[PDB]
Amino acid sequence: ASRLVLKVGDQEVKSYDLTGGAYDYTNAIITDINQLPDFEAKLSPFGDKNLESSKLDK
Q: How many CB atoms lie within 10 A of CB 18?
A: 21
**Phi/psi class of residue 41: alpha, beta or left (left: φ > 0; alpha: ψ in -120 to 50)?**
beta
Q: Does 11 bind a copy of itself (CB under 8 A)?
A: no
Q: How far is the CB of 41 from a copy of itself (least distance, A)?
A: 20
CA 47 to chain centre: 18
Give the residue, chosen from 8, 13, 22, 43, that forms a contact with a copy of itself under the rule CB under 8 A.
22
- Does residue number 51 form part of the binding site for a copy of itself (CB under 8 A)? no
CB of 21 to a copy of itself, least distance (A): 5
